[PDB]
Amino acid sequence: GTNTGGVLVITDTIIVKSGQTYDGKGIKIIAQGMGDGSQSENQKPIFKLEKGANLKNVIIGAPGCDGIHCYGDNVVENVVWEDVGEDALTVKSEGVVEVIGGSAKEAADAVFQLNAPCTFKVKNFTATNIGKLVRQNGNTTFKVVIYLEDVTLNNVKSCVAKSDSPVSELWYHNLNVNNCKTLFEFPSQSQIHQY
Ligand SMILES: O=C(O)[C@H]1O[C@H](O[C@@H]2[C@H](O)[C@@H](O)[C@@H](O[C@@H]3[C@H](O)[C@@H](O)[C@@H](O)O[C@@H]3C(=O)O)O[C@@H]2C(=O)O)[C@H](O)[C@@H](O)[C@H]1O
Ligand SMILES: [Ca+2]
Ligand SMILES: [Ca+2]
Ligand SMILES: [Ca+2]
Ligand SMILES: [Ca+2]
């Protein structure tokens, strides 16, 4: 992309409005004053994607802070997290959220955090050195449906995906996992399906 080689240093969350597409054209973003990328829960998101907002073609440098907050009906395309912060992307409100392309590395805990009922799809994605790829918020029992399609994972220190919800489901297709003791931590393994 034509912003490749540039570094945008920001000091507040970038809000992408409903109906908008933020296209970074390959820019690298470094956030300052928004978090250190540790496990502290009080960091700011790099991006807030309002319902029906899209994001594409961004590299998020360290510190990853609180990553991308999605409010539903969002396409997140070609986003690279060089160093995931507290988490990489959080679904904050109901809708369909797509992560297509890109990659993530160095997530101490979760990459994707699902805090509202949603349909969540990860497609054509790589992640390395992570605690979990997907976590439905603990002890919640609303329904999420997760799809992992063409996803390649390496060095997964807890599990691919974890939910405490019996009604939630995970579907996978062309999933490749290296160095994970425990793929799925759901109430029953019958909640996990191939397609
Ligand atoms: O949106 C968030 O960032 C979310 O973070 C916390 O919750 C997650 C997870 O949903 C919780 O179940 C909990 O996870 C457990 C441990 O606390 C955690 O360090 C790791 O060991 O995983 C555990 C697990 O998956 O069960 O805490 C997670 C976290 O620390 O990020 C908040 O509690 C939640 O309110 C919200 O802010
Ligand atoms: Ca955490
Ligand atoms: Ca957290
Ligand atoms: Ca990290
Ligand atoms: Ca978080």
Tell me the pairing of strands 47-49 and 14-16.
parallel
75: amino acid identity, one letter: V
In this structure, which residue's CA is closest to atom 18 in ligand 1? 109
CB-CB contact of 57 with 26 (8 Å) = yes
CA atoms within 13 A on the CB side of 144: 34
Which bound ligand lies closest to the C-alpha atom of 131? 1
Going from the Cα of 20 to the center of ligand 4, the distance in angstroms, rounded, reads 29
Tokens of 166: 């019996």
The number of helices, as runs of H, and strands, as runs of E, in the chain is 0, 15
| CA of residue 105 relative to chain centroid, distance | 11
Method: X-ray
Omega before 45 within 30 of 0, i.e. cis:
no
The string of DSSP codes covering 55-107 is EEEEEEPSP-TT-EEE-SSEEEEEEEESS--S-SEEE-SSEEEEEES-EEEEE
In this structure, which residue's CA is closest to atom 3 in ligand 1? 41
139 — phi, psi (to 5°)?
60, 15
CB-CB contact of 110 with 87 (8 Å) = yes
CA atoms within 13 A on the CB side of 155: 9
CA pair distance 127, 104, nearest whole angstrom:
5
**What's the CATH number of domain 1-195, 2.160.10.10, 3.90.1310.10, 2.102.10.10, 2.160.20.10?**
2.160.20.10
User: Who's near 181: CB < 8 A, 6+ residues apart?
Assistant: none
Q: Is 73 in the pocket of ligand 1 (CB under 6 A)?
A: no
In this structure, which residue's CA is closest to atom 2 in ligand 1? 113
